[PDB]
C-alpha cells in the first residue's frame, strides 16, 4: 500500500523560509515523480511543481520558480519542499503527491493517483 | 495556462440518487482530464484519470466520459461515503491545472 507521510502543521514568521517533507513507504520511490501542490481556503488546487527521484529533475510552475524548491532524498524514501521568503499568501495547506504510471513512453497523464495528508502553514506575524 | 471551470459549484442530492458533474477546459486537452475527490478531514484520492479509466480500488459507480474541452463524472448509487468535493484536473499542458471544485451535498 502506497503511503505518504507528510510533515507536522508548522507556524512560521513572514519573510522566513521552511521546509517541509514527504515520506515515501509501500513503492518505488525512484520510478514514480513526486508532485507538489498547494490549496487555499476553500478554494482550488495550484500546482508548485514536481521532483525526479531518480534523476532529480524538477520542474517549476512559473508562478513558484522563485517561491519553491524541491529536493529528493534517494535513501531516506523522502521528497522535500523548501519555501523562502514567507507571507500570508503562502498560507495554505500544501500536498504531496505520486505521479501514476504513465500512458507510454514519454506520455504522462499527469494524475496524481496517491496523496499525502497534507501539510498545513500558517504564517503570522 | 489552460484554464479548468466545473459546474455547479455546489450539488446537493440524495442517497441512492444518479449525479453528474461537469467540467470545461479552456482548450482542448485531449482527454487528459483527471477526477479528484476531497473529504473535509483534508484527504485527496484519484478516482478517474484520462477522462474515463477506474483508479485502483475506486468503486465502478464512478463513470467518466467527455472529449476536448467538455468532461463530466458520473456516481450511480450516491453512497454516504460519496459526500465530499470533486475536482477535474487536466493534464495535458503544463502546468497542471485543477478546477474550482464541486461540493456534493446530501
Ligand atoms: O517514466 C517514469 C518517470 O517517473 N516512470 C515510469 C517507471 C520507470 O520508468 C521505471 O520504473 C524505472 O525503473 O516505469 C513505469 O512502468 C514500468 C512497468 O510497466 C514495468 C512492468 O510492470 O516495466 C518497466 O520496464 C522495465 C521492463 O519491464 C524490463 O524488462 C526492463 O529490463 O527494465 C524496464 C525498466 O523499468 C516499466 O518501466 C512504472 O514503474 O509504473 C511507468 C512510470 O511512468
Known amino acids: 500500500?502506497?503511503?505518504?507521510?507528510?510533515?507536522?502543521?508548522?507556524?512560521?514568521?513572514?519573510?522566513?523560509?521552511?521546509?517541509?517533507?514527504?515520506?515515501?513507504?509501500?513503492?518505488?520511490?525512484?520510478?514514480?515523480?513526486?508532485?507538489?501542490?498547494?490549496?487555499?481556503?476553500?478554494?482550488?488546487?495550484?500546482?508548485?511543481?514536481?521532483?525526479?527521484?531518480?534523476?532529480?529533475?524538477?520542474?517549476?510552475?512559473?508562478?513558484?520558480?522563485?517561491?519553491?524548491?524541491?529536493?529528493?532524498?534517494?535513501?531516506?524514501?523522502?521528497?522535500?519542499?523548501?519555501?523562502?521568503?514567507?507571507?500570508?499568501?503562502?498560507?495554505?495547506?500544501?500536498?504531496?503527491?505520486?505521479?501514476?504510471?504513465?500512458?507510454?513512453?514519454?506520455?504522462?497523464?499527469?494524475?496524481?493517483?496517491?496523496?499525502?495528508?497534507?501539510?498545513?502553514?500558517?504564517?503570522?506575524? | 495556462?489552460?484554464?479548468?471551470?466545473?459546474?455547479?459549484?455546489?450539488?446537493?442530492?440524495?442517497?441512492?440518487?444518479?449525479?453528474?458533474?461537469?467540467?470545461?477546459?479552456?482548450?482542448?486537452?485531449?482527454?487528459?482530464?483527471?477526477?479528484?475527490?476531497?473529504?473535509?478531514?483534508?484527504?485527496?484520492?484519484?478516482?478517474?484519470?484520462?477522462?474515463?479509466?477506474?483508479?485502483?480500488?475506486?468503486?465502478?459507480?464512478?463513470?467518466?466520459?467527455?472529449?476536448?474541452?467538455?468532461?463530466?463524472?458520473?456516481?450511480?448509487?450516491?453512497?454516504?461515503?460519496?459526500?465530499?468535493?470533486?475536482?477535474?484536473?487536466?493534464?495535458?499542458?503544463?502546468?497542471?491545472?485543477?478546477?474550482?471544485?464541486?461540493?456534493?451535498?446530501?
Open positions: 503527491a505520486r505521479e501514476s504510471p504513465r500512458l507510454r513512453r514519454g506520455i504522462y497523464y499527469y494524475a496524481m493517483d496517491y
Open positions: 521532483i525526479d527521484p531518480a534523476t532529480a529533475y524538477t
Open positions: 482548450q482542448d486537452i485531449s482527454n487528459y
Open positions: 484520462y477522462t474515463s
Open positions: 509501500g513503492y518505488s520511490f525512484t520510478s514514480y515523480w
Open positions: 484536473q487536466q493534464g495535458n499542458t503544463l502546468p497542471p491545472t
